A = this chain, B = another copy of it.
Amino acid sequence: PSPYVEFDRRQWRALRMSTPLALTEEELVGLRGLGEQIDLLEVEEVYLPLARLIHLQVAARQRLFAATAEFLGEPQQNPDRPVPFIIGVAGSVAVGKSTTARVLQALLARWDHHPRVDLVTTDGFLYPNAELQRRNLMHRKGFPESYNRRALMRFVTSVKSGSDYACAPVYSHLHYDIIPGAEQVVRHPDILILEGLNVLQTGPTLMVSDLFDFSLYVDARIEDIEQWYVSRFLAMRTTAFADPESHFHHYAAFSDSQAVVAAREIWRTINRPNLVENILPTRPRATLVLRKDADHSINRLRLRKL
């Protein structure tokens, strides 16, 4: 067959699992907190079992650190604690990577084995617009060479080294740019989740995904992502684009049909080809592939056989 265990949505719901996990209320509220109309039943029935499965791998890895150091008789060059466990999250623009990552961050943090869960986006590793322009790369923003790969690699290397201090830059969607002087600090978390278009992309030598212990790809039909993309663009007319200072402000004025035309064109010329050429070929590289239906609900989980 294949290197994956496949469950469709029914098959997965059917599963007679070995613990009731039960979200508090409390937790259900916190999950509504980031609630871009987050489906709480799906968080509970799909993501929570999911996070438990990841938990098992984090915990196993914690014990392996311990057993290994015991064997070595705890040499001075060995770290005193397991380095952070790194989870990559990949997928198209508008597939909902980000919400997926934020859910997992909250769900994974409820175990005492690893309460400290961080979330970094590779958006912060895009070259500033100014630099991107100097390189004649603006039409290519979001494509592989539009990221400071050297810096992104230094960052993840540093976190995997168990260094207790590592900075990422920050990117503002509002301004469509890197915020000068802004940094996010990461202090040896138990889990780092690294979310981005490009986390499973491949390169000539050691690549960031070589430092991952788990990774997911959020999948859906290309037609469906297109519709979610267009719907998001029109909704931003009245949120992010409403705000002046948003350098897509001139988009807040577009009528529905004018905004559709414009959104479709950014889709067909930039995001869809990025997906076909650079993001989609990384799908088979993830530990877990979650496919979404048109209504955003998960209709298929593929997980690496253990």
Contacts and interface: CB of A to CB of B under 8 A. Distances in A.
B60 A206 contact: no
Interface string A275-289: 000000110110000
Contact of A68 (B1, B15, B53, B160): B53
Contacts of A53: 68, 71-72
Contact of A63 (B6, B60, B284): B60
Interface stretch (A73-81, A117-125, A225-233): A73-81
B71 A18 contact: yes
Given A6-B77, A53-B71, A202 B211 contact: no
Q: How many copies does the complex hold?
A: 2
Given A15-B73, A71-B17, A202-B207, A157 B306 contact: no
Nearest to A75: B15
A6 to B, nearest CB: 6
B73 A5 contact: no
A61 B213 CA distance: 13
A205 B202 contact: yes
A204 interface: yes
Given A6-B77, A15-B75, A60-B61, 8 more contacts: A3-B157, A7-B75, A17-B71, A57-B64, A65-B306, A83-B305, A162-B305, A204-B281
Interface of A: 1-3, 5-7, 11, 15-19, 49, 52-53, 56-57, 60-61, 63-65, 67-73, 75, 77-79, 82-83, 157-158, 160-163, 202-207, 210-211, 281-282, 284-285, 305-306
15 contacts: A1-B158, A3-B211, A5-B79, A11-B75, A15-B73, A15-B75, A18-B70, A49-B71, A53-B68, A60-B60, A69-B306, A83-B305, A162-B305, A202-B205, A206-B285
